[PDB]
Amino acid sequence: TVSHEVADCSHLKLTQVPDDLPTNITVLNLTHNQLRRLPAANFTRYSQLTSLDVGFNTISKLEPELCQKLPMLKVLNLQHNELSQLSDKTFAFCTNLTELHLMSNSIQKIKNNPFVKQKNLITLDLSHNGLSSTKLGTQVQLENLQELLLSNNKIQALKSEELDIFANSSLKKLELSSNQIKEFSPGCFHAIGRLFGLFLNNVQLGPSLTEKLCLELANTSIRNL
RNA sequence: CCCCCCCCCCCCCCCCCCCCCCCCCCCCCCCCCCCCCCCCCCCCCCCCCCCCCCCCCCCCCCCCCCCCCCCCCCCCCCCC
């Protein structure tokens, strides 16, 4: 685990996090490991981190006390894990995050409300998940959100009520690639506050569905398609 | 030569309630085993593409060297 300012533990087959590192480290990387559990009790010493890349590992579920100890954590990477369950208190105490990757966690459904308790989030990733609807909450949140990725999901319909959350959000990227959406609801994109870019790569529309898509983009601020 | 009415004690049967003890079924939680699917760690094997390295072979170019063939010149000498 070589580290001078950047802490790297890539491809080192770690089972538990190390406990001998400088306190003032900002980024700590443990990609490509098998941290089966990530206890919060081992991070008493680690309280000055900003980015935490713990992706490509085998974490089952997370605890609220993990980011209690981190008041300055800003990047939280959970790529290729088993975090299939989310709760209101999963990301409650930590709200300074501006980056949150959840690619390939086999997330099935968003139950009630995982993302109100943060307002400074910028980029949200939900690629390679089992989501079938774009509903991520009940009320309106993610005011400062700009980047949203939902590629390689199992979404077949893009309903207007599913995007009522983003009535006051400026979104520059809606990554909905590799999802077999076959129905478009009126006002689905008008519910979005500020839509700037739509990405529908590898998605089977056809000419008629493309025409309906363009009709649904009437009177909006889209820049890229 | 008889019936009736009171009372004690002990029975038997029947309905209700409360106890233990057990059986069957079911619920909840936990453990073990088997099967299916998925993720990650490595160490890899096979195939294709791309890039280089060595050696070698064919063809070509350039510079030659030797030999053969042809032509010209210089000097010397004869024939009529």
UniProtKB/Swiss-Prot annotation:
Changing residue 223 to G: No effect on IFNL1 induction. Changing residue 106 to P: No effect on IFNL1 induction. Residues 1-23 form the LRRNT domain. Glycans are attached at residues 24, 29, 42, 96, 168, 219, 224. LRR repeats lie at residues 24-45, 48-69, 72-93, 96-117, 120-140, 144-165, 170-191, 194-216. Changing residue 67 to A: Reduced response to ds-RNA. Disulfide bonds join 67-94. It is found in: Endoplasmic reticulum membrane; Endosome membrane; Early endosome. Belongs to the Toll-like receptor family. Key component of innate and adaptive immunity. TLRs (Toll-like receptors) control host immune response against pathogens through recognition of molecular patterns specific to microorganisms. TLR3 is a nucleotide-sensing TLR which is activated by double-stranded RNA, a sign of viral infection. Acts via the adapter TRIF/TICAM1, leading to NF-kappa-B activation, IRF3 nuclear translocation, cytokine secretion and the inflammatory response. ds-RNA binding is mediated by LRR 1 to 3, and LRR 17 to 18. Monomer and homodimer; dimerization is triggered by ligand-binding, the signaling unit is composed of one ds-RNA of around 40 bp and two TLR3 molecules, and lateral clustering of signaling units along the length of the ds-RNA ligand is required for TLR3 signal transduction. Interacts (via transmembrane domain) with UNC93B1; the interaction is required for transport from the ER to the endosomes. Interacts with SRC; upon binding of double-stranded RNA. Interacts with TICAM1 (via the TIR domain) in response to poly(I:C) and this interaction is enhanced in the presence of WDFY1. This is Toll-like receptor 3. It comes from Homo sapiens (Human). The gene is TLR3.
